[PDB]
């Protein structure tokens, strides 16, 4: 009856079907502290999806079969009542409430049941979103009297959106904050899961493979959370061993190269950082080794805990920052131009940092949470900073001291891993780490050969003629350059002379 | 028999009770192509209401009777499936089970039946479903394993709501796009229907009235 909507976690614990939890036994003690109450003995595990909240009550179910519980929690059977399974297959009036009363009938009958309602935010809005009888209004009488012990588990956002907004429901449940682990806490989690892996995958897992699964998932994965995405890396590591046995750290770096997409895995590449930055920039090599120099300190050596990863003034400029973003964690598209020449007024200062609520631009601006700290590292370029109002880069004085921006929607976006670069008061300039000077005919013609080879490599692959002359590279150097300005986007001169006459080859 | 739970659409075609469709030959042969396939052998005729989806298979019934048909489906009796008469009088337990098994064994008994289910969305989700399996779940294994070829006709909207709901239908039905006629094709339709309306109203209909009625509509 109650087996039709979830499994018995206590019966799975005494059959050894549950993964052991190492650490978070202060969280399990807090849940027992709620469950041993009289009146509202219903904990809700507040977390975020993958920190281990099923794992908390998986450890509570193991604690019951070990007898490490109070006398009000011994011989209790935990059932992961999926209330979404109660909604599923319920097309009719009253069909939903019938298989919830069958569940609550076995609560009254057994008397030793602790429901684990995963995704407790679903409890509001199971029949009518509190407009009528939902699954919340069915449970709220028995939850308030301690006659139904229910462990909820929900995200902190979903606790605020659904459980806190129903003020009658929030008193029935007691928030047990299950925090995201630390990396050193994740490694000792995976030590006890080594026995579960080696029995299943037929692998042997070395010691630092855990270290390269927990540090490395924190470094490149930010959508997922610690004690899940690191289990994922050891999972996908044996999924390369099912293609084949000892896993490496390179075995985890392989399967994160599948997941995130970057293959770059820092001391070796930081020394010859210049050469991987020369592959897109030839000419003006003094600034290349200059922005290589300060970053050899920040990512190798000593660093303040509250600073961006280098700060620069640029006075190609933006082509170097795109190659700088490619070395930074492995992606070309991390460079975000703000175009500070598109803002001149004081009321437009809220159009790039977020609006105060109620006002225009509450989402045009204030999306920086989903941009900057969504990526593990970033380079934010402020193109034409001299055209802005003073009031706009008074707000950039936060992120040069601390590396924190307060969105207009109330979010703290950390710029502490972001290379903040300005491009053209003494208080604004001394917080910037460097002043890097770009100098404005032999350097242009070498960028001609760099940029025609990207086009011509594809051209002859589709059986097209390649007719070039080194004298004509100097003709590309005259138009695609400006002393008063800057090398008139040579690429526009290449599509002038080469790509327009590319049509005049089939004719 | 299928004559009690439907009507012979080719016997209606040889008794001259189906309206001729002058034009529409590309879509009648389209149905005959996607009957002769191996994986989606079921034409479902999608189209907006009024474009002549039923008139395609009635034009197919006239194609079989006239002999304008391949001799893989020559003398192949089209029966439209009246779901009304199939449900009607199923007052006792397992009648609608038994009736729909009878009309499917009568197809396999003779083999000169190609079945047309008008409003194929009505088949999905209705017919006996309280204490027995419905109409669609009886058709479903003979459409999946293959013992039975329907011709279907849904609305373009009703095709997405009921047939494109489960994937195991989608890999057996081929949507035949029965589009709107253009105005010039409609004049060809109306000039071909002219004898049926000159005889019913005993009026004459000019060529102007045909090109007016297609352009002005």
């Amino acid at each position: 009856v109650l087996d039709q909507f979830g499994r018995n976690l206590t019966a799975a614990a005494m059959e050894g079907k549950l993964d052991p939890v190492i650490g978070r036994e202060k969280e399990i003690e807090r849940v027992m502290q709620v469950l041993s109450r009289r009146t509202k003995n219903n904990p809700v595990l507040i977390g975020e999806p993958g920190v281990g909240k099923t794992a908390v009550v998986e450890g509570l179910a193991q604690a019951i079969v070990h007898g490490e519980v109070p006398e009000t929690l011994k011989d209790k059977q935990l059932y992961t009542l999926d209330l979404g399974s109660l909604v599923a297959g319920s097309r009719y009036r009253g069909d939903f409430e019938e298989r919830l009363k069958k569940v609550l009938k076995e609560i009254n009958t057994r008397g030793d049941i602790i429901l684990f309602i995963d995704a407790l935010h679903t409890l509001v809005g199971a029949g009518a979103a509190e407009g009528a009888i939902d699954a919340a209004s069915i449970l709220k009488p028995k939850l308030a009297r301690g006659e139904l012990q229910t462990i909820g588990a929900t995200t902190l956002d979903e606790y605020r959106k659904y459980i806190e907004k129903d003020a009658a429901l929030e008193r029935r449940f007691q928030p047990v904050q299950v925090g995201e682990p630390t990396v050193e806490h994740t490694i000792e989690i995976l030590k006890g899961l080594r026995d579960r892996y080696e029995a299943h995958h037929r692998v042997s897992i070395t010691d630092a493979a855990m270290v390269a699964a927990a540090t490395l998932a924190d470094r490149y994965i930010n959508d997922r959370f610690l004690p899940d995405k690191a289990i994922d890396l050891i999972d996908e590591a044996g999924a390369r061993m099912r293609i084949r046995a000892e896993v490496d750290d390179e075995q985890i770096a392989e399967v994160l190269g599948n997941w995130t997409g970057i293959p770059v895995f820092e001391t070796t590449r930081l020394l010859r950082m210049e050469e991987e930055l020369h592959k897109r920039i030839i000419g003006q090599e003094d600034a290349v080794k200059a922005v290589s120099k300060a970053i050899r300190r920040t990512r190798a050596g000593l660093k303040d805990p509250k600073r961006p990863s280098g700060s620069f003034i640029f006075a190609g400029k933006t082509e170097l920052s795109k190659a700088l973003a490619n070395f930074l964690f492995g992606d070309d598209d991390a460079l975000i131009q703000i175009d500070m020449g598109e803002f001149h007024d004081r009321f437009t200062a809220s159009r790039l940092f977020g609006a105060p609520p109620g006002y225009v631009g509450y989402e045009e601006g204030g999306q920086l949470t989903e941009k900057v700290r969504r990526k593990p590292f970033s380079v934010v370029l402020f193109d034409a900073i001299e055209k802005a109002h003073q009031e706009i880069y008074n707000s950039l004085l936060q992120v040069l001291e601390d590396g924190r921006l307060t969105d207009g929607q109330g979010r703290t976006v950390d710029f502490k891993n972001t290379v903040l670069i300005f491009t053209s008061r003494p208080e604004f300039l001394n917080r910037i780490d460097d002043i890097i000077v770009f100098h404005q005919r032999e350097e242009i013609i070498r960028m001609v050969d760099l940029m025609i080879s990207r086009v011509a490599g594809q051209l002859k692959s589709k059986d097209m003629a390649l007719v070039l002359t080194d004298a004509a590279k100097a003709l590309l150097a005259k138009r695609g350059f400006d002393p008063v300005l800057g090398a008139r986007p040579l690429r526009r001169t290449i599509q002038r002379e080469i790509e327009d006459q590319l049509s005049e080859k089939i004719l | 028999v299928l004559d009690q739970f439907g009507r012979n659409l080719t016997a209606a075609a040889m008794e001259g009770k189906l309206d001729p469709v002058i034009g529409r030959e590309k879509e009648i042969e389209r149905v005959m192509q996607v009957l002769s396939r191996r994986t989606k052998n079921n034409p479902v005729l999608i189209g907006e209401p009024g474009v002549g989806k039923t008139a395609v298979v009635e034009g197919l019934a006239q194609a079989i009777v006239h002999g304008e048909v391949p001799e893989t489906l020559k003398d192949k009796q089209l029966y439209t499936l009246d779901l009304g008469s199939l449900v009607a009088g199923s007052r006792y337990r397992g009648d609608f089970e038994e009736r729909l098994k009878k009309v499917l064994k009568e197809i396999n008994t003779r083999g000169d039946i190609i079945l047309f289910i008008d409003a194929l969305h009505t088949l999905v989700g209705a017919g006996a479903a309280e204490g027995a399996i419905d109409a669609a779940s009886i058709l479903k294994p003979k459409l999946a394993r293959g013992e039975l070829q329907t011709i279907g006709a849904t609305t373009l909207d009703e095709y997405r709501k009921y047939i494109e709901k489960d994937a195991a239908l989608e890999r057996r039905f081929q949507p035949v796009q029965v589009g709107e006629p253009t105005v010039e094709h409609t004049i060809e339709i109306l000039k071909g229907l002219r004898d049926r309306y000159e005889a019913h109203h005993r009026v004459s209909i000019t060529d102007a009235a045909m090109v007016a009625a297609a352009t002005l509509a």
């Binding site: 319920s90 097309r91 009719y92 009036r93 009253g94 069909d95 939903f96 029949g127 009518a128 109620g358 006002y359 225009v360 509450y362 | 199923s90 007052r91 006792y92 337990r93 397992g94 009648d95 309280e130 204490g131």
Partner: peptide, 23 residues
């Protein structure tokens, strides 16, 4: 300075329905 537009949805109204017995 700018409205929010709550934009109330309509619901499907989970239905009772009569059924048909057969003896």
């Amino acid at each position: 300075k700018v409205l929010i537009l709550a934009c109330l949805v309509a619901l499907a109204l989970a239905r009772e329905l009569e059924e048909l017995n057969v003896p």
